[PDB]
Design a protein around this ligand. Structure first.
Ligand code: LOG
Length: 635
């Protein structure tokens, strides 16, 4: 069961799902929950479904937890009970019930369940290509299955979300799409929260306030019932906390508290993590004091990218005078775009549920791939006391890709770290093989003999990686997932082939070694060609994989064996580990830039564009040699 329930008593009997059944409370329970129950009983004992207060569930009123979104669930030989404290609770009972049913069978169980954190879900809030409409449809259904009740729409690059077109209603096509997303959100018990991001060019006047409210009104007409205003990542007048708080309170008093049926009203502050706060400035205490108490305030932790600690959340809660609504910046990869972040969710304090109003994850622009972290976050926010990092990661993968779960585990296990970055945030990766790696390498470098078992583990790892990559490439169960990851799967296969060949180099005679060495060089060039043609975004272009432990191991082993060979045979083989066509500290190629890692000869004459050192326009001059750090060319 994911999320794990608050309380579970298991009998180790099982019963058959009733072929004949009496349904009770069908006409009066949450229709969303009844429809789910009706699909499970498709094709087909008393079955009682309802909310506390329905006649159907009167007998169980004392067992239904007294919590928002709580439910009581029971399966024995005589009857099944599915009883929410409220309509969403009934739906949630059904989502648990759906996981109990396996091959027409049910375990005898009794569950009392409820979430520890009130708002749980996803903020689509990253920079990059916004999720596709089809991907959002898929996400919403995923959220309902995992008891996430919150979807905050706010892609930084949607021009109708952010500046200047925040002021304009969505075009007809986009409008009808959002209208469909809201309906689907509603059917899956998810609050569609529409965010606006106006602060970079907002004027503190009646004109812009009215345009904002008019925009909120248009969204309301599309079916939207929760709203957010984001003031993150801006400078200038829009950073004024008094004005922000006045605007939010106006929205609250003239809009949210005036419509019949508005739910969440959320803001993200300009000072949205501690490092970006001014402890000595008046910004957060002003919001805390002035913002109306029903309005939620978002927080990403001690840093833009960070895990949530007891001390960290105490710090913010004391200032905002309410429990922070956490905006968790993982697995978002918009600042390490050459990486996929597919590892487990961990690092968040599991005892601080009372200290947060909400917990949402900011995911990758890769929607399907983000489901691993999203599933885990749903498990963590619902039952943080029972949260199990590794089991939930494994459960997520088996959920997303049952036909190739182990292959996806293999790929994800080695695609979890971010590499060095300006946010200082890192994750573990390849932890299984890390000790056999460091040992193999330490011994190897010193001239000491390595353990054969360690050499075999590495060998076994490369073999498994190639099986996993080729199987994932051909998988048709979740095509959108395969599309997202495919460039990384190719790079991951090359990595493993490169590992096997390097290991063969450590292992016969001069001729054989030279074959292996030339093969390694060709594989390096192939990796370079993938890094240069795939995922060519303006920020971190290319495709990096197994970067924490596996690639450094392979590279360092390769450099070492080439050195020993050169000493033994008095040779001059090139030991460099990344392919570079241009000659020169390693050079790097990024899009049409050639740079020296913080005289040069290009492999051809190109028209020059510019040169920047830490600048001169080259006005298209033919160029092949630069002597005296980035050269831009036409390419
Ligand atoms: C509140 C917030 O996190 N705003 C942005 C952010 N600000 O530092 O960092 C994230 C990771 O780069 C971005 O995806 C977010 O859109």
């Amino acid at each position: 069961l994911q999320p794990p329930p608050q309380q579970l008593i298991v009998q180790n009997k099982t019963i058959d799902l009733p072929a004949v059944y009496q349904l009770n409370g069908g006409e009066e329970a949450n229709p969303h929950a009844v429809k789910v129950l009706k699909e499970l009983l498709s094709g087909k004992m008393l079955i009682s479904i309802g909310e506390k207060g329905d006649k159907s569930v009167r007998k169980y009123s004392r067992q239904i937890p007294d919590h928002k979104e709580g439910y009581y669930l029971s399966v024995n030989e005589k009857e099944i009970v599915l009883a929410g404290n409220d309509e969403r609770g009934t739906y949630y009972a059904l989502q648990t019930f759906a996981q109990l049913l396996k091959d027409g069978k049910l375990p005898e169980v009794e569950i009392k369940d409820y979430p520890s954190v009130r708002y749980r879900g996803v903020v689509e809030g990253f920079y990059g290509t916004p999720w596709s409409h089809q991907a959002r449809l898929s996400q919403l259904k995923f959220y309902g299955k995992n008891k996430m009740n919150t979807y905050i729409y706010g892609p930084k690059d949607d021009p109708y979300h952010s500046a200047p077109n925040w002021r304009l209603p969505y075009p007809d096509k986009e409008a009808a799409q959002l209208q469909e997303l809201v309906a689907v959100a509603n059917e899956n018990e998810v609050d569609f929260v529409w965010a606006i991001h106006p602060g970079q060019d907002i004027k503190w006047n009646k004109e812009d306030r009215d345009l904002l409210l008019a925009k909120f009104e248009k969204m309301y007409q599309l079916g939207v019932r929760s709203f957010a205003v984001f003031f993150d990542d801006i400078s200038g007048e829009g950073t004024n906390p008094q004005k922000q708080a006045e605007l939010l309170n106006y929205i609250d008093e003239k809009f949210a508290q005036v419509k019949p049926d508005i739910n969440q009203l959320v803001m993200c502050p300009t000072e949205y993590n501690k490092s970006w706060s001014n402890p000595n400035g008046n910004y957060l205490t002003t919001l805390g004091d002035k913002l109306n108490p029903s309005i939620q305030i978002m927080w990403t932790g001690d840093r833009v990218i960070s895990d949530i600690t007891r001390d960290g959340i105490s710090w913010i809660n004391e200032r905002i005078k309410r429990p922070a609504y956490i905006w968790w910046n993982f697995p978002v990869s918009d600042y390490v775009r050459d990486h996929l972040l597919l590892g487990p969710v961990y690092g968040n304090d599991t005892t601080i549920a009372k200290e947060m109003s909400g917990f949402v994850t900011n995911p990758m622009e890769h929607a399907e791939s983000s489901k691993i972290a999203i599933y885990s976050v749903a498990s963590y926010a619902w039952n943080p006391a029972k949260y199990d990092t590794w089991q939930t990661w494994k459960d997520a993968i088996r959920t997303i890709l049952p036909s190739a779960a182990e292959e996806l585990e293999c790929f994800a296990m080695h695609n979890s770290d971010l590499g060095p970055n300006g946010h200082g945030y890192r994750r573990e990766e390849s932890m299984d093989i890390q000790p056999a790696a460091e040992r193999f390498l330490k011994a190897f470098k010193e001239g000491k003999n390595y353990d054969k078992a360690d050499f075999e583990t590495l060998q076994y790892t490369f073999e498994r990686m190639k099986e996993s990559a080729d199987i994932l490439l051909m998988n048709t169960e979740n095509k959108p997932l395969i599309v997202e990851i495919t460039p990384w799967v190719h790079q991951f296969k090359l990595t493993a082939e490169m590992g096997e060949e390097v290991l063969k180099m450590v292992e016969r005679n001069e001729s054989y070694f030279l074959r292996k060495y030339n093969h390694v060089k060709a594989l390096q060039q192939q990796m370079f060609y993938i890094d240069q043609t795939s995922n060519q975004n303006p920020y971190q272009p290319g495709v990096k994989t197994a970067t924490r432990v596996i690639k450094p191991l392979i590279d360092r082993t390769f450099a070492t064996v080439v050195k020993f060979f050169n000493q033994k045979f008095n040779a001059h083989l090139d030991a460099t580990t990344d392919y570079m066509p241009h000659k020169m500290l390693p050079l790097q190629v990024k899009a049409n830039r050639v740079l020296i890692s913080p005289e040069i000869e290009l492999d051809a004459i190109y028209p020059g564009e510019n040169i920047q050192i830490n600048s001169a326009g080259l006005q298209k001059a033919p160029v092949k040699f630069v002597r005296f750090f980035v050269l831009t060319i036409e390419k």
